[PDB]
Design a protein around this ligand. Structure first.
Ligand SMILES: C[C@H](CCC(=O)O)[C@H]1CC[C@H]2[C@@H]3CC[C@@H]4C[C@H](O)CC[C@]4(C)[C@H]3C[C@H](O)[C@]12C
Ligand SMILES: O=S(=O)(O)c1cccc2cccc(Nc3ccccc3)c12
Ligand code: NA
Length: 159
């Protein structure tokens, strides 16, 4: 069945620039700006569009070794990005897929708001524990702050 989790978090970076950096150049930026969170990102198949498969590896000592994600949808106009965790880490005999949706919305002070939905597709009924979802939020949060700091510090990057 599906468990749906939503959250919002704010960013000090405008929506277009954050979308270009955080989403469209995430494979490059995450290993560089947050090495203690994501050790590498390998493009397995595809050009960044729908269907593209990537392998996200975590640093030594993390609960999981890696996950493989698949790009579902990329909407440059509304700054929407949908992707699914399809293999590895928690994927297995109790969790079939995590389907996530990120939308980034402009705020009038020059910042942005990121609205995130995670949908955990389980086999049988194995419930998603508060820490399966809470670990996920912290990680997303850590990556966003690390990209934010880099973009503040590198004003000519991603304009
Ligand atoms: C934001 C990028 C998309 C851009 C890119 O691939 O460069 C995506 C692609 C894979 C994503 C990671 C996959 C596994 C995790 C799923 C969790 O529910 C949130 C934290 C993690 C660690 C995700 C954080 C972030 O959502 C990533 C890194
Ligand atoms: O919210 S953040 O940390 O900002 C976040 C930021 C950027 C990308 C994210 C991708 C997936 C999940 C997140 N958090 C999340 C939210 C609810 C449940 C599980 C994970 C992401
Ligand atoms: Na839950």
């Amino acid at each position: 069945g599906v468990f749906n989790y939503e959250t919002e978090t704010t960013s000090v970076i405008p929506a277009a620039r954050l979308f270009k950096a955080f989403i469209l150049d995430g494979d490059n930026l995450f290993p560089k700006v947050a090495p203690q969170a994501i050790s590498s990102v390998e493009n397995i198949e595809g050009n960044g569009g729908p269907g593209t498969i990537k392998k996200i590896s975590f640093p030594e000592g993390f609960p999981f070794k890696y996950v493989k994600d698949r790009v579902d949808e990329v909407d440059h106009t509304n700054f929407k990005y949908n992707y699914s965790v399809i293999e590895g880490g928690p994927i297995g005999d109790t969790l079939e897929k995590i389907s996530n949706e990120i939308k980034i919305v402009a705020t009038p002070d020059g910042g942005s708001i990121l609205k995130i939905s995670n949908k955990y597709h389980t086999k049988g009924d194995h419930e998603v524990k508060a820490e399966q979802v809470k670990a996920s939020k912290e990680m997303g949060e850590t990556l966003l702050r690390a990209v934010e700091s880099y973009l503040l510090a590198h004003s000519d990057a991603y304009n």
